[PDB]
Amino acid sequence: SLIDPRAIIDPSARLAADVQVGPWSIVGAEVEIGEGTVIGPHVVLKGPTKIGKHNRIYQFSSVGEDTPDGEPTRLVIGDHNVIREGVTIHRGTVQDRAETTIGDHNLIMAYAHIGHDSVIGNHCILVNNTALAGHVHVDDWAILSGYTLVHQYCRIGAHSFSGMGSAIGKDVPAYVTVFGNPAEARSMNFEGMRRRGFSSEAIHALRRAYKVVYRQGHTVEEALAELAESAAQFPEVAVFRDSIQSATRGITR
Amino acid sequence: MSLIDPRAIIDPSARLAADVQVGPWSIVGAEVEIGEGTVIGPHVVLKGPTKIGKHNRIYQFSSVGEDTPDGEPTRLVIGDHNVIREGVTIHRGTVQDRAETTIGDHNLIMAYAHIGHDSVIGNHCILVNNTALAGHVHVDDWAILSGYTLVHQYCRIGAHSFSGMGSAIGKDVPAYVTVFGNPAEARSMNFEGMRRRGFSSEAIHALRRAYKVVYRQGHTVEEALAELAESAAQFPEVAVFRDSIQSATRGITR
Amino acid sequence: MSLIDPRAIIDPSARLAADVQVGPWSIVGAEVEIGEGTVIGPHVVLKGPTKIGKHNRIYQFSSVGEDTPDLKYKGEPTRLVIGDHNVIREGVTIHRGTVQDRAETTIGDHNLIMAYAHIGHDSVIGNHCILVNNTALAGHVHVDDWAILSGYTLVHQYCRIGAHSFSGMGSAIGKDVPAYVTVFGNPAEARSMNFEGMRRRGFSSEAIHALRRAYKVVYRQGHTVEEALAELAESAAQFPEVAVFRDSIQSATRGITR
Numbered sequence A: 001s002l003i004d005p006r007a008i009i010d011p012s013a014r015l016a017a018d019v020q021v022g023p024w025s026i027v028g029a030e031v032e033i034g035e036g037t038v039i040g041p042h043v044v045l046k047g048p049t050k051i052g053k054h055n056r057i058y059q060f061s062s063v064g065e066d067t068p069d070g071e072p073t074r075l076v077i078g079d080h081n082v083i084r085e086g087v088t089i090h091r092g093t094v095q096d097r098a099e100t101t102i103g104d105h106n107l108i109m110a111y112a113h114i115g116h117d118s119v120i121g122n123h124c125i126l127v128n129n130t131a132l133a134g135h136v137h138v139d140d141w142a143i144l145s146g147y148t149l150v151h152q153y154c155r156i157g158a159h160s161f162s163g164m165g166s167a168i169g170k171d172v173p174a175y176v177t178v179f180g181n182p183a184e185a186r187s188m189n190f191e192g193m194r195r196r197g198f199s200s201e202a203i204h205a206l207r208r209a210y211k212v213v214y215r216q217g218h219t220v221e222e223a224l225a226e227l228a229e230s231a232a233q234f235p236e237v238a239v240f241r242d243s244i245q246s247a248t249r250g251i252t253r
Numbered sequence B: 001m002s003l004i005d006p007r008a009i010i011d012p013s014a015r016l017a018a019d020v021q022v023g024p025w026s027i028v029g030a031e032v033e034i035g036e037g038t039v040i041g042p043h044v045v046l047k048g049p050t051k052i053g054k055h056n057r058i059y060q061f062s063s064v065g066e067d068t069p070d071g072e073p074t075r076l077v078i079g080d081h082n083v084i085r086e087g088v089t090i091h092r093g094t095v096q097d098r099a100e101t102t103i104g105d106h107n108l109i110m111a112y113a114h115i116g117h118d119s120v121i122g123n124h125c126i127l128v129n130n131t132a133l134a135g136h137v138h139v140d141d142w143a144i145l146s147g148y149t150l151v152h153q154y155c156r157i158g159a160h161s162f163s164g165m166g167s168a169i170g171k172d173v174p175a176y177v178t179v180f181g182n183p184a185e186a187r188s189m190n191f192e193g194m195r196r197r198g199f200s201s202e203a204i205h206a207l208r209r210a211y212k213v214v215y216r217q218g219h220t221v222e223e224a225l226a227e228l229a230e231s232a233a234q235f236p237e238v239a240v241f242r243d244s245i246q247s248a249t250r251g252i253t254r
Numbered sequence C: 001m002s003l004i005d006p007r008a009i010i011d012p013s014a015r016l017a018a019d020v021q022v023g024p025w026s027i028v029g030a031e032v033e034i035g036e037g038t039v040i041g042p043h044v045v046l047k048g049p050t051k052i053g054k055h056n057r058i059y060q061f062s063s064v065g066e067d068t069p070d071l072k073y074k075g076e077p078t079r080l081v082i083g084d085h086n087v088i089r090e091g092v093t094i095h096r097g098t099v100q101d102r103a104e105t106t107i108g109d110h111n112l113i114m115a116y117a118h119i120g121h122d123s124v125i126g127n128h129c130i131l132v133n134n135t136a137l138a139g140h141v142h143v144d145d146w147a148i149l150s151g152y153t154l155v156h157q158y159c160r161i162g163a164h165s166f167s168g169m170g171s172a173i174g175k176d177v178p179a180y181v182t183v184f185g186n187p188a189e190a191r192s193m194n195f196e197g198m199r200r201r202g203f204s205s206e207a208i209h210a211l212r213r214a215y216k217v218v219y220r221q222g223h224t225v226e227e228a229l230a231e232l233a234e235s236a237a238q239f240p241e242v243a244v245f246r247d248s249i250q251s252a253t254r255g256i257t258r
């Protein structure tokens, strides 16, 4: 039996035929689970929530809860995600998007917290006890090391990196490496660029870009103007320029 | 359908008010008392001697009323209208201290927060995710401890005080004071909280002056306490600030 | 009052000593071996290949013996070995090793692993250690005997935590911690030595005196690690405790916490 007889499946929950649900797990009202998803034992799923295909949800996780902070609120999870033990994921709020969104191929490790209205892209890694306070946007390939704490409304750029125990209060531009409490910009995620097979011309253009923004005494407005030529030439320097441009809380330094 | 789920384990000695709800696979241990309107979620472990009041809400994977990992009976007393989120750990007292861990009313204890043995939480406190109270910690009314605040043993957290995220508090936090970092450092006062509480402009103004007296005028704790005496008799809110510095045994956060 | 609760799941490949206690809604997975006098609480997940020794106590919501989620691991027959008289509190996560290292996570005897602590792949814990609430060992972390890691201590991969060392609450350890050294903050900084622990253990005043002197040689006299190790050589020959300290600086591959 794919659905263990000790599991609780709410009559309003919609499941694909091959979904697996472990013992003592609760698939609450308005939960939707897609093809090939494996729900481990002792899992609490609450809705309105959509869980896509080939996901893996480990024991003691509480996914789709109401934020502790009849309003129609939602949580949407994509495909091929791994949600480890004790992870807490809250649904969105009417006083925003009404949605917490998680894309594809993400790895959300033990006791990580995804606050209401957060948006996670694809291929992200949120290491043990990473906490997103709420309204946090995490772009593609970002890595947040163990116990990274993220202030509300913060944007974590594409391929960015945070060291363990970092406390992020400002936006992290794309590819930037950040460390400490409060978080400070240190360098670019060159190891990340190598894993993805970026060209030597692109890696050099990104190293040049970091210096314009952080190591040349330029203001945000001064740096953005100087980056315009490199961003037009390289689509990845454009990813860097855009994350600085769209920063609301200022950039991490 | 049934208020007490048939899959839950309820010890014969536990005392539950008629309308108490217990979710599936929860354990309500011996000598655990639960008051009217309380909702115990699924997968909850409740150990005693413990008294839980009225209209509380306890979420899944919480362990409430456990013995300390660090024999006369030791209690855990929880008040009314509290919210205890998932994976919260609350230990009972130790006979060598007060033999009781106490939590008042209208508290919000968020996911994975830890309340060490012999800790006392007042009313209307917010303990954000993973806040940890090492033991013998006193948290006075309306305190806000942001995500992952670590509080050293025997520390006192003043009324209406605030800690920033990831704060590591080794010293007493006076009432109203905002603390940040590891190690925690005093920054200002939570004037925002005062206004939400309906404090008068005059009370707020006297507290602002009280902060300056303690932290920005080079006074010793003794000189500061004598200078605050006058304003403290005029305003009960300044007497609260002055009393928290007077009661400091680990010194104040600077 | 059956020792194995009827609501618990015992895989038929699991090997248990006859007096093993297993609480309701606990899972004793495939290839899990449990020794005499061990008590498994309710709501515990045990996965293998795992050996759990004698007189252990494993609390509710713990996940012991899982695979590391780390992208480098690929379903290998890796192990977790836990010794005797250990206490694993509620919500603790312990992962098995990886073939890329020595394919084993090892925990010795008389350890206290407090609530929500994390023991990453290929970590080695000795004896009489205390890992306070939410301490996290990223992976390949070696914790020698009698170390105390205070609440929310974070340890970088491959770090070595020396015997009788101490970390303050919220420490972020990125380099090796020599034996007896006390470290605080993010990033961790060396402060002094755990003289309190040395006294509790019954070290002679002569040994304590020579350890205090050894700390100054390494940290307070502006010497290099090579110079410091040559200067400590004779004190190390007369005091096993100084040899323990000297060895921890010798074996440091990530540099020592300064």
Ligand SMILES: N#Cc1ccc(CN(Cc2nnc(N)o2)C(=O)CSc2ccccc2Cl)cc1
Residues within 6 Å of the ligand: A125, A127, A128, A143, A144, A145, A146, A147, A164, C069, C070, C071, C072, C118, C120, C136, C137, C138, C139, C154, C155, C156, C157
């Ligand atoms: N898949 C993967 C993956 C990728 C990057 C990281 C980032 N990273 C370094 C690292 N790389 N491999 C490991 N195990 O750790 C940390 O977060 C260390 S801190 C930590 C680590 C684990 C647990 C608790 C804590 Cl506190 C971590 C895992």
Ligand SMILES: N#Cc1ccc(CN(Cc2nnc(N)o2)C(=O)CSc2ccccc2Cl)cc1
Residues within 6 Å of the ligand: A068, A069, A113, A115, A131, A132, A133, A134, A149, A150, A151, A152, B108, B126, B128, B129, B144, B145, B146, B147, B148, B165
């Ligand atoms: N009810 C409430 C309430 C009141 C004050 C706070 C204080 N606060 C800022 C904030 N306000 N609303 C939200 N969600 O966060 C934090 O603790 C941020 S850190 C954090 C936040 C949430 C989770 C994990 C972490 Cl680490 C938080 C919640």
Ligand SMILES: N#Cc1ccc(CN(Cc2nnc(N)o2)C(=O)CSc2ccccc2Cl)cc1
Residues within 6 Å of the ligand: B069, B070, B114, B116, B132, B133, B134, B135, B150, B151, B152, B153, C112, C130, C132, C133, C148, C149, C150, C151, C152, C169
């Ligand atoms: N058995 C034991 C034992 C030995 C040393 C320690 C080291 N220690 C000081 C201390 N001693 N007794 C208590 N309760 O705390 C801390 O880790 C403080 S931080 C903390 C503490 C507890 C929970 C969460 C946090 Cl964050 C802790 C426990």
Ligand SMILES: [Cl-]
Residues within 6 Å of the ligand: none
């Ligand atoms: Cl066998």
Ligand SMILES: [Cl-]
Residues within 6 Å of the ligand: C034, C035, C036, C052, C053, C054
């Ligand atoms: Cl054995």
Ligand SMILES: [Cl-]
Residues within 6 Å of the ligand: C071
């Ligand atoms: Cl990676």
Ligand SMILES: [Cl-]
Residues within 6 Å of the ligand: B069, C089, C090, C113, C114, C115, C133
């Ligand atoms: Cl514990």
Ligand SMILES: [Cl-]
Residues within 6 Å of the ligand: C150, C167, C168, C169
């Ligand atoms: Cl400490």
Ligand SMILES: [Cl-]
Residues within 6 Å of the ligand: C195, C196, C199
């Ligand atoms: Cl001493």
